[PDB]
C-alpha cells in the first residue's frame, strides 16, 4: 500500500535567503541607457558682497565645475538548464 502516497511538493522552489543590503537603497540610482553617466558637481561656491548704495559692484566669483564619469559596466551570468527539465518540471524554471 505504501506506493499510493505521492508526497506533496512545495508551491515554489525556495532558497537560502542571502543578504540583500546592497547600498542601492540609499545611493543615488539614475537609469541611463548609454555607455557612461557624466554627473556634474560644483566643487566650489559663489561670492557675495553686502553692497553699499554707491559701491559700483565688481565681479563675484563663479563656481567651478567638475565632471565625474560613470563607465556603466555590465554583469553577466549564463546558467545552462537542460531542455528535458524545462518542460517536465511543473515549477517555472524560466522565471526561477
Amino acid at each position: 500500500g505504501g506506493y499510493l502516497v505521492d508526497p506533496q511538493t512545495s508551491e515554489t522552489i525556495r532558497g537560502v535567503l542571502r543578504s540583500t543590503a546592497s547600498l542601492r537603497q540609499i545611493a543615488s540610482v539614475v537609469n541611463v541607457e548609454a555607455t557612461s553617466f557624466d554627473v556634474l558637481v560644483d566643487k566650489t561656491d559663489m561670492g557675495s558682497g553686502w553692497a553699499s548704495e554707491t559701491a559700483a559692484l565688481s565681479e563675484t566669483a563663479t563656481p567651478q565645475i567638475d565632471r565625474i564619469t560613470i563607465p556603466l559596466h555590465e554583469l553577466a551570468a549564463m546558467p545552462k538548464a537542460s531542455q528535458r527539465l524545462l518542460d517536465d518540471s511543473a515549477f517555472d524554471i524560466e522565471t526561477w
Binding site: T62, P63, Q64, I65, D66, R67
Partner: peptide, 9 residues
C-alpha cells in the same frame, strides 16, 4: 558658469 574655454570653470 564662467568662460567655456577652460574645463573646470
Amino acid at each position: 558658469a564662467l568662460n567655456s574655454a577652460v574645463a573646470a570653470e
